[PDB]
Amino acid sequence: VPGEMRLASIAFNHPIQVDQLNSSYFKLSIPTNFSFGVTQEYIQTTIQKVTVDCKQYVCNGFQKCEQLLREYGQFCSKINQALHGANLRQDDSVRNLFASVKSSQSSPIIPGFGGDFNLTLLEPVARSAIEDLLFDKVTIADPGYMQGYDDCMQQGPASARDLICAQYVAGYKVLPPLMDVNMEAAYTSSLLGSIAGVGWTAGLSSFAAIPFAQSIFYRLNGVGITQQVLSENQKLIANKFNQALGAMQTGFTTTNEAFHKVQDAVNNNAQALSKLASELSNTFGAISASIGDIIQRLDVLEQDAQIDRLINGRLTTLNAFVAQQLVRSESAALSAQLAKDKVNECVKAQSKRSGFCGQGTHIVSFVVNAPNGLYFMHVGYYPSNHIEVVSAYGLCDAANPTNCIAPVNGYFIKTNNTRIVDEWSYTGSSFYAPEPITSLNTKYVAPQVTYQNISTNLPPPLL
Amino acid sequence: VPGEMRLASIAFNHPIQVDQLNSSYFKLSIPTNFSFGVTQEYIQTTIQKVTVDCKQYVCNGFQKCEQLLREYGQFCSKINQALHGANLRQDDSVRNLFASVKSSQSSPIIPGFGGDFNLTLLEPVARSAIEDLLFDKVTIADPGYMQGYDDCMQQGPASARDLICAQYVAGYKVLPPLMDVNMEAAYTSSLLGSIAGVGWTAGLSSFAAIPFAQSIFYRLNGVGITQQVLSENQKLIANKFNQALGAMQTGFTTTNEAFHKVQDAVNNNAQALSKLASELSNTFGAISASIGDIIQRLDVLEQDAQIDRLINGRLTTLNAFVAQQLVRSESAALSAQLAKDKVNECVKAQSKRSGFCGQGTHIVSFVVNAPNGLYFMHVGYYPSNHIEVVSAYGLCDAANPTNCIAPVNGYFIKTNNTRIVDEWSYTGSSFYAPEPITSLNTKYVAPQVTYQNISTNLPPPLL
Amino acid sequence: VPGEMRLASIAFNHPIQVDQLNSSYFKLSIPTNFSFGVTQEYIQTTIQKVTVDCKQYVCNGFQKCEQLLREYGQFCSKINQALHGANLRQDDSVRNLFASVKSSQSSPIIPGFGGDFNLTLLEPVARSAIEDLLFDKVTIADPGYMQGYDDCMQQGPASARDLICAQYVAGYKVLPPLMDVNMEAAYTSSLLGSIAGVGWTAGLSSFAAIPFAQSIFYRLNGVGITQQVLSENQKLIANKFNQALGAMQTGFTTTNEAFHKVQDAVNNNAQALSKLASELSNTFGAISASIGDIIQRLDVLEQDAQIDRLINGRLTTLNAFVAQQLVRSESAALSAQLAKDKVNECVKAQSKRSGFCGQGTHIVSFVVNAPNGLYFMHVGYYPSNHIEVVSAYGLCDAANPTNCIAPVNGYFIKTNNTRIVDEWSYTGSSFYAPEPITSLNTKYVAPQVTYQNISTNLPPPLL
Amino acid sequence: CVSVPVSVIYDKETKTHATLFGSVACEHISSTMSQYSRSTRSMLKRRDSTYGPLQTPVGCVLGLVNSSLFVEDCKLPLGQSLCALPDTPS
Ligand SMILES: *[C@@H]1O[C@H](CO)[C@@H](O[C@@H]2O[C@H](CO)[C@@H](O)[C@H](O)[C@H]2NC(C)=O)[C@H](O)[C@H]1NC(C)=O
Ligand SMILES: *[C@@H]1O[C@H](CO)[C@@H](O[C@@H]2O[C@H](CO)[C@@H](O)[C@H](O)[C@H]2NC(C)=O)[C@H](O)[C@H]1NC(C)=O
Ligand SMILES: *[C@@H]1O[C@H](CO)[C@@H](O[C@@H]2O[C@H](CO)[C@@H](O)[C@H](O)[C@H]2NC(C)=O)[C@H](O)[C@H]1NC(C)=O
Ligand SMILES: *[C@@H]1O[C@H](CO)[C@@H](O[C@@H]2O[C@H](CO)[C@@H](O)[C@H](O)[C@H]2NC(C)=O)[C@H](O)[C@H]1NC(C)=O
Ligand SMILES: *[C@@H]1O[C@H](CO)[C@@H](O[C@@H]2O[C@H](CO)[C@@H](O)[C@H](O)[C@H]2NC(C)=O)[C@H](O)[C@H]1NC(C)=O
Ligand SMILES: *[C@@H]1O[C@H](CO)[C@@H](O[C@@H]2O[C@H](CO)[C@@H](O)[C@H](O)[C@H]2NC(C)=O)[C@H](O)[C@H]1NC(C)=O
Ligand SMILES: *[C@@H]1O[C@H](CO)[C@@H](O[C@@H]2O[C@H](CO)[C@@H](O)[C@H](O)[C@H]2NC(C)=O)[C@H](O)[C@H]1NC(C)=O
Ligand SMILES: *[C@@H]1O[C@H](CO)[C@@H](O[C@@H]2O[C@H](CO)[C@@H](O)[C@H](O)[C@H]2NC(C)=O)[C@H](O)[C@H]1NC(C)=O
Ligand SMILES: *[C@@H]1O[C@H](CO)[C@@H](O[C@@H]2O[C@H](CO)[C@@H](O)[C@H](O)[C@H]2NC(C)=O)[C@H](O)[C@H]1NC(C)=O
Ligand SMILES: *[C@@H]1O[C@H](CO)[C@@H](O[C@@H]2O[C@H](CO)[C@@H](O)[C@H](O)[C@H]2NC(C)=O)[C@H](O)[C@H]1NC(C)=O
Numbered sequence A, B, C: 001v002p003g004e005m006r007l008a009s010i011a012f013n014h015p016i017q018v019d020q021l022n023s024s025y026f027k028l029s030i031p032t033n034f035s036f037g038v039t040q041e042y043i044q045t046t047i048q049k050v051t052v053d054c055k056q057y058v059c060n061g062f063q064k065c066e067q068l069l070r071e072y073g074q075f076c077s078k079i080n081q082a083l084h085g086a087n088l089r090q091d092d093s094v095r096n097l098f099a100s101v102k103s104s105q106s107s108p109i110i111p112g113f114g115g116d117f118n119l120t121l122l123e124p125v126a127r128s129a130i131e132d133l134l135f136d137k138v139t140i141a142d143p144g145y146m147q148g149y150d151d152c153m154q155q156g157p158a159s160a161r162d163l164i165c166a167q168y169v170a171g172y173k174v175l176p177p178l179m180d181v182n183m184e185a186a187y188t189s190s191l192l193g194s195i196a197g198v199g200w201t202a203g204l205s206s207f208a209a210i211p212f213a214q215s216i217f218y219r220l221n222g223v224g225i226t227q228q229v230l231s232e233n234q235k236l237i238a239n240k241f242n243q244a245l246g247a248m249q250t251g252f253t254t255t256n257e258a259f260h261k262v263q264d265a266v267n268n269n270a271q272a273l274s275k276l277a278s279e280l281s282n283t284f285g286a287i288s289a290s291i292g293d294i295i296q297r298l299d300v301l302e303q304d305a306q307i308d309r310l311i312n313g314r315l316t317t318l319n320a321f322v323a324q325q326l327v328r329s330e331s332a333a334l335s336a337q338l339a340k341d342k343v344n345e346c347v348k349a350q351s352k353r354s355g356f357c358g359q360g361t362h363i364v365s366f367v368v369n370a371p372n373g374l375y376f377m378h379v380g381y382y383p384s385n386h387i388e389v390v391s392a393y394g395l396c397d398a399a400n401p402t403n404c405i406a407p408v409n410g411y412f413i414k415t416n417n418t419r420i421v422d423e424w425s426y427t428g429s430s431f432y433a434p435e436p437i438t439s440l441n442t443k444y445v446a447p448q449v450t451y452q453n454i455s456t457n458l459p460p461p462l463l
Numbered sequence D: 001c002v003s004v005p006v007s008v009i010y011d012k013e014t015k016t017h018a019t020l021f022g023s024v025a026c027e028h029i030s031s032t033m034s035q036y037s038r039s040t041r042s043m044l045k046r047r048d049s050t051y052g053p054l055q056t057p058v059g060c061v062l063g064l065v066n067s068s069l070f071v072e073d074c075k076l077p078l079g080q081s082l083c084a085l086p087d088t089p090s
C-alpha cells in the first residue's frame, strides 16, 4: 500500500541554452515542429440581483416587532435604495457589454462553417457545445419565476425544498436575469457570423464573408510561418486545430481552474443568500430568534428587550449584506468592461501582445456565455524541436557594397537545405523551412558591417 | 387620454446577412455612404478633500464630553491620519495626471484653428464651450475659501445657509482643489496646441504645427478611405464633422449617461458630508444628540451615560466615513491612471483598438475638465448604405502565373464602375469608390489559387 | 539665519511655441541634441500570508475564556476559512506571474553581456545590483522559520524581541514566501537571457542570441533616429545609457517615490500584524485585557461579564483584520496581473504607447524583484535643443506632376546642410541630421497640392 | 512561555498526512509529545513511529521521507522551494 509523503523540491525547468557568438553571425534557434493547444479563462460579469422587504425580513408578521422596527425604518430605506443602485449598475453593465458584442452585418451560419476545422461551438440548432458543457457541469440551481409558487404551495409536490420557496417567508426576492438565453445566443451568433475575417483592414465597415480556414491561414502567415509551409500542411494544421479544440471535451472539469472559477461565481451568489437566510434563525444576544416564541413564553416588559435585540441583529446583517453587494457590483462592472475590450481585441481580432490568451502569440479566440459571466477559449502556438543554424543580420552583393538586403519577417541563414544551391537561404520567424532568397522575402536596406557577402547568387538584387 | 402600459419584447435588430460563397470569389458588403457621430464618457478622478476636528465634531464645546471623549482619543487620531493619507493620494494623483497632459512644445492657438472644422472647444478668450456647459448645467455647489466667513457671520446676508457655514459648528473642513481653473486650462490648452498632428512618426520629439483639417484627412486615409474620395468630399467631411460636434449642444442633459455620471460624482461628495453633518443631530440610543440638553435636564449620574452613548455614536460615524473615503480614494486613483493612458492613446493619438471611443474605429478625441474629473468626447465612424459586389482575394497576369498582386488596405472587385474599362477595380476598405488598379493601391505577392486571372489589362505589373 | 516661509505660486512652465504657417510648407521643430534618463515604478504583488489560532488569540490558555469562547466558535471558523481563501489567492497569483516570466529558451549570461552598456543588473555571481539596493535600503524585518524558536526560548540571546517571538503567545503565525530567493532569481535570469532581442518578428518561436547593444540600436532606429547618426554616435549612446543607468545609484532613497512605495508595502504588512498584536492588550469596555487578572481580582459572578467583553472585543478585531486582508488580497491580485502584462509589453518588447515607462516613447525596460513586489526601471528619451526649419508635406518632380514621394519615418526639409547641394534634404522624426533624399528614406505616393516641386535633383525617382 | 505551532499536510486521495512544527525546529521534536495540542497523534504514529523528524527550511516535519526529488506541483507545496509529494495509490 502507499507510504509516507515524500520530500521533493519545487522544480524549475531550465530554458534551452543558446550560446552567444561574436562578430557578424549568430546561432539561431528555430523550431521545426509546430503544434497547437488551448488556454481558458472565465470572466464573471454578474452578481445575482436582489431586493429585500425589510418589514418581512426582520420579523415574520409580528406587530410588536413592527412597532419597534419602526424606530429603525430609516435603516431599511438605506438598504433598499443602496441595492436599487447596485441592481441598476448590474443591468447597465450587461446591456452595455452585449451592445459591443452585436455586429452590424454578418455571415449566416449553417453546419459546415469551419471547413476542415471542427468548430464544435456552432449553434446546435441555439447555444454551443461549450455552453451546454458549462451549464450542465456546473452545479447551478434551478430558477423560479415560472411556474414558481405552485411548487411552494400545498397544491404541489411535498418534496419541494427550494431556497426560492423560502423567500415567501424571508421577504427576500431573487430577481430575473436581464437578457434571457435566446437574446444572449443572438449576440454570440452575431459574433460567430463575424468570423472570417479580421484581415483586409477596417472590417468595421465592409464585410468579406470568407471561410474560417482561410482566416486561420492568414493568421498563421501573420506570426511568421511562410505560405509554402501552410499550403503543404493545410490538412495537418486543421487536424492539429481540431486536437487543440478537442481538449475542451475534458476541460469542463473540477481540475480546470477556469471551470472552478465559474463554479465559484455560482457559489458566491448562493452564499450571499444563504447567509441572509440563516441569519433569520440566529439569536443576537436574544433569548430567541423567533418573535412568536419571545411573546409566547415571556411577560411583555421582557419581550420588548428580546425583540429589540433581534431587530437590531437582523438590521445589522442587512447592513453587512448590502456593503458586500455594493463592492461585488463594482468589481463585476470592472470585469464586464475588461471583457468588452477582450471581445474587441482577441475574438474580433488577432492579438500581437503576448501575455494574453494562448501561451504563444495569438490565433483565434472564442467567447461563450457562462454561469454568471463569459467564458473564453484561446488557441495558442506551441513550437518545438528547435534546431540550431547560423544566421546573418542581412546580405550584400559581394561585388557591390551598396547592394544590401535584409529578411522580411524572418531570417537569412546559411543554407543547410540540399534543394538550395545558393549559400544562403530564408526561413520564417516561426518555422524552419529554408526557401531561396528572393524579393518576396526581402527588403532593401542601408549597408551594415554585419551583412554577409554573396559573390555568387543572390536574386535580390540579382545584379 | 393615455391608457395602460403595453406588452412589448425587448427588440434585437438582426445584423445584415451576407451570404457566404465557395471557390475563389466572394460577396463583399461595402458601405457607400459615410457619416460621423459622437460618443462621450466621464472619468471621475477626484474625491473632495476632507479633514475633521474630532474634538469639535463629537461635541460642540462641552467639557463633560471632552472628559469622556479623552478615553477614546486614539480613535480620532486614526481618523485624521487615515484621511491625511487619502488626501495626499488625491493630490499626487491630480499632479501626476496633469504632468502627462502637458506638452514640451505646442502650436499657439488663435480663433480660426480648425479650418472648416468648427472646434467649439477652442478657448473662449480660457476654458471651452464644453467646460462651460458642464459647469453651468451640473448642480455643483458654490465654493467657500474666499470671502468665506463674513457670509456666515452676523456681519453678512441673513439668508446664507451654506453647508460650508455649518462647518464652523461641525468641526469639519472642506479643503481647496489642487490645481485651480487657470492651471487646469493651461494644461488642456497645451493639448489643443498639440493637435495637428500625431502622424509623421515620433511627435514625441519634433513638432509639425500643421492644420487640424489635415490631421483629419490623414486619419481618414488611415481607416481605409482612399484619397480621391477625401479630396472630392473634403467640404462635406467638414460639414459632417461639424454636425457630429453640434450634437454636443444637446449632450449636456440629464438624458445623457456620461452627463449623469458627472452629476453623480458631485452628488457622491455632497452625501459624504451631508451624512457626517446629519449624524450630529442623531441620537445613538441616547436621550439626546445635544450635550447641552443632556446636561440641562439630567442629574450628573445619568448625564455621563447619555454622553458616552453620544460619543461612541459620533465616533462610529467617523469610522464609517473614513473607511468609505479610503475606498473612494483608491478607486479614484485607478480612474486617474486610466485617464492618463487614454489621453496618451486617443487624444494624443489615433486608436486602432475598437471597443473604445466612438463606435466605429477611431477619429480624433478630445478631453476637457469636468466636475470631479475629466470628460471625453470621441468622434466615431458610422458607414451605411452598403452594397454587395463580388471580390477577389488577389489578381494574377493570366499570361504569367508568377505575376501576382494583392490589394493594399482595400479590395479588388469586379468592376461595376462604368468609368473603368478594365474588368477589375480597386476600392478602399472603408468606402466604395472603384479606382483603376495601379501600383499605388497594390502589392506584389506569392501566387495563390484564389487570385483571379486578368488576360487584358492590369498595370501592376503591366507586363 | 533662515526667515519666514515665502509666498510663491505653483509654476507652470509654458511649452515652446511653434507658430503655424499657411499654404504648403510648415515650421518644423526638430531636436538636435538627444539624451537619456530613467523613470521607476513599484508594483506591490504580495500581502504577507497569515493564519490565526483563535483559541489562543482570544485568550492566553484560560478555561473560563474557552467556555465562553465556545459560544462564538462559528466566528473564528469564518476567520480562518476566509484567510485560507486569501492565502490561496496569494499563492496562485505569485506562481501564475512567474510562469509568464520564464522563457522556453534563452542566452547564457556571463559578465560582459551588455557590451559598452554597463548593465549593473547582471547577476553578481545571484540577484542584481538593484535587488541588493532595494533589500538593503528598505527597512524590512528579519524572517523567522529557521532557526526560529531557539532565539525566542530561554536557550538563546536574552535580547531577542522579535514580533515573531510574540507569535508563540499571540497564536498568530507568519507564513513563508512561495518562491524563495533562488527561484525568483532563476525567473529573472531567464528574462535577462531573453534580452537581445525583441526584433526579427515572433521571438515567441525562434531565438537570435545577439548583443545587447544591437538591440538598443535597433530600438533607436525604431523611434525615428537614422542609422548614420547611430553609427557615428554609438559610443556616445552607450555613455548616455550608462549615465541614465547610473542614476539608479541614488534612486534607492526616501526622496524617490517608487522607493517610498516599496517601503510602504513593507509598512502595511507590519501594521496589519502590529494591530492584531496590540489589540491583545486592549480592553473592550472590560476591566482588564488579561483573563488572569480578571480571575485573580474578581468574584466569579463578575468575571464572566468581564471575560465576555474581552472575547467579543478580540473577535471584533479579528473580523476587521480579515475584512482588510480580503480586500488587500484582491487588490494585490489585480496588481500582479497588470505586472504580467507589463513584463510582456515593456521588458520583453518595445512600447509604442507613450504614457508608460520613460517619459519619452520607449527604450528597454527592466524588472527586478522587490520587497513585496516587483520593481521596474524604464529608460526614456529626452530630446532637446530644438531648431526650427521649414518642411514639405512631400515632394514631386517639377517636370512630371505624377512623380511624387513622401518621407519615410521622417520629414523632407529645406536643406540647410552645406554638404547637400540639393534644395531638399531628409531628417528622421526624432533627430536632426539632414541626409540626401534617396529611395531608402522615401515612399512613392499619390500627388498632392502640398508636395513641393524639385526641378533639379531628386533621385527618388531620378527621372 | 513558548509553544509549538502546528500545521498538517493532508491528502484527501490517499487519506494520509504529515506534519510541521514550523520554527520549532527538530532539535525539540520527537514522535511523542507532552505539551499537548490534541488528545491523540496516532494517525501520524502509524508511520512516524519509525522515523526521526526531518528538518527542512519551511519547518520541522514528521512523516517526510527524504527522496531528493524535484516536482512542479505536489498540490501540497510547502512554500519556498519545497513540496510534500503524495505517494502513489496501489
Ligand atoms: C512533430 O509533432 C507531431 C505531433 O504533433 C509528431 O507526430 C506524431 O507524434 C505522436 C506522438 O505519440 C505519434 O503517436 C503519431 O503517430 C505521430 N504522427 C505520425 C504521422 O506518425 C511528429 O513525430 C513530431 N516530429 C517531427 C515532425 O519531427
Ligand atoms: C469533430 O467533428 C465531428 C462531427 O461529426 C465530431 O463527431 C461527433 O461527436 C458527437 C459528440 O457527441 C457525436 O454525438 C456525433 O455522433 C459525432 N458524429 C459522428 C459523425 O460520429 C467529433 O467528435 C469532432 N472532434 C472533436 C475533437 O471534437
Ligand atoms: C560585406 O562586405 C562589405 C563591403 O562590401 C563589408 O563592409 C565593411 O564595413 C566596414 C564598416 O565600417 C568598413 O570599415 C569596411 O571598409 C567595409 N568593407 C569595405 C570593403 O568597404 C562588410 O563588413 C562585409 N560583411 C561581413 C560580414 O564581413
Ligand atoms: C545540416 O546538414 C547536415 C548534412 O546533411 C545534417 O547532418 C546529418 O543529419 C542527419 C540527421 O538524421 C544524420 O542522420 C546524418 O548522418 C548527418 N550527416 C552527417 C554527414 O553527419 C545536419 O543535421 C543538418 N543540420 C540541421 C540543423 O538541419
Ligand atoms: C448619405 O447620407 C447623407 C446624409 O448623411 C444624405 O443626404 C442628406 O440626407 C438628409 C436626410 O434628411 C436630407 O435632409 C438632406 O437634404 C440630404 N442631403 C442632400 C444634399 O440632399 C444622402 O442622401 C445619403 N445617401 C446617399 C449619398 O446615397
Ligand atoms: C459653427 O461655428 C459657428 C461660429 O460662428 C457657430 O455660430 C455661433 O454660435 C454661438 C452660440 O452661442 C453664437 O453665440 C454666435 O453668435 C454664433 N456665431 C455667428 C456668427 O452667428 C455655430 O453654431 C457652430 N456650429 C455648430 C454645429 O456648433
Ligand atoms: C489563375 O491562374 C492561375 C495559373 O496562372 C491558377 O493557378 C492554379 O493553382 C492551382 C493550385 O495548386 C494549381 O493546381 C493549378 O495547376 C494552377 N493553374 C495552372 C495553370 O498552373 C489560378 O487558380 C487561377 N485563378 C483562379 C481564381 O482560377
Ligand atoms: C452595377 O451596375 C449595374 C448596371 O449599371 C447597376 O444596375 C442599375 O442600377 C440602377 C440603380 O438605380 C438602376 O436604376 C438601373 O436600372 C440598373 N440597371 C439595370 C440594367 O437594371 C447595379 O445597381 C450596379 N450595382 C452596384 C452594387 O452598384
Ligand atoms: C548636448 O548634450 C550634451 C550632454 O548631454 C552636452 O555635452 C556636455 O554637456 C555637459 C554639461 O555640463 C558638459 O559638462 C560636458 O563637458 C559636455 N560634453 C562635452 C564633450 O563637452 C552638449 O554640449 C549638448 N549640446 C550640443 C551637442 O549642442
Ligand atoms: C560601469 O561599470 C563599472 C564596472 O567596473 C563600474 O565600476 C565598478 O563599480 C563598483 C561599485 O561598487 C565597484 O565596486 C567596482 O570596483 C568598480 N569597478 C572598477 C573596475 O573600478 C561603474 O561604476 C559602472 N558605472 C555606472 C554609472 O554604474
Ligand SMILES: *[C@@H]1O[C@H](CO)[C@@H](O[C@@H]2O[C@H](CO)[C@@H](O)[C@H](O)[C@H]2NC(C)=O)[C@H](O)[C@H]1NC(C)=O
Pocket (backbone or CB within 6 Å): C024, C396, C398, C400, C401, C402, C448, C449, C450, C451, C452, C453
Ligand atoms: C507642385 O507641382 C504640382 C504640379 O506638378 C502642383 O499641383 C497642382 O495641384 C492643384 C490641386 O488641384 C491643381 O489644381 C493644379 O492645377 C496643379 N498644378 C498643375 C500644374 O497641374 C503642386 O501644387 C505644386 N506644389 C506646390 C507646393 O506648389
Ligand SMILES: *[C@@H]1O[C@H](CO)[C@@H](O[C@@H]2O[C@H](CO)[C@@H](O)[C@H](O)[C@H]2NC(C)=O)[C@H](O)[C@H]1NC(C)=O
Pocket (backbone or CB within 6 Å): C387, C388, C389, C416
Ligand atoms: C541655417 O544655415 C545658416 C547659414 O549657415 C545658419 O546661420 C549661421 O548660424 C551660425 C550659428 O552659430 C552663426 O554663427 C552664423 O553666423 C550664421 N550665419 C549667418 C550668415 O548669419 C543657421 O543658423 C542655420 N539654421 C539652422 C536651424 O541650422
Ligand SMILES: *[C@@H]1O[C@H](CO)[C@@H](O)[C@H](O)[C@H]1NC(C)=O
Pocket (backbone or CB within 6 Å): A020, A021, A022
Ligand atoms: C569570439 O571570437 C574569437 C576569435 O578567435 C573566437 O575564438 C571565440 O570563440 C568567439 N566567441 C564566441 C562566443 O564565439
Ligand SMILES: *[C@@H]1O[C@H](CO)[C@@H](O)[C@H](O)[C@H]1NC(C)=O
Pocket (backbone or CB within 6 Å): B020, B021, B022
Ligand atoms: C457552391 O458551388 C456550387 C457549384 O455548383 C454552387 O452551385 C453553389 O451555389 C455554391 N455555393 C454558394 C454558397 O455559392
Ligand SMILES: *[C@@H]1O[C@H](CO)[C@@H](O)[C@H](O)[C@H]1NC(C)=O
Pocket (backbone or CB within 6 Å): C020, C021, C022
Ligand atoms: C498667410 O499667408 C499670407 C500671405 O500673404 C502671409 O502674409 C501670412 O503671414 C501667412 N500666415 C502665416 C501664419 O504665415
Ligand SMILES: *[C@@H]1O[C@H](CO)[C@@H](O)[C@H](O)[C@H]1NC(C)=O
Pocket (backbone or CB within 6 Å): A007, D054, D055, D056, D066, D067, D068
Ligand atoms: C536529503 O538528503 C540530501 C542528501 O544530500 C541532504 O543533502 C538533504 O539535506 C536531506 N534532507 C533532509 C530533510 O533530510
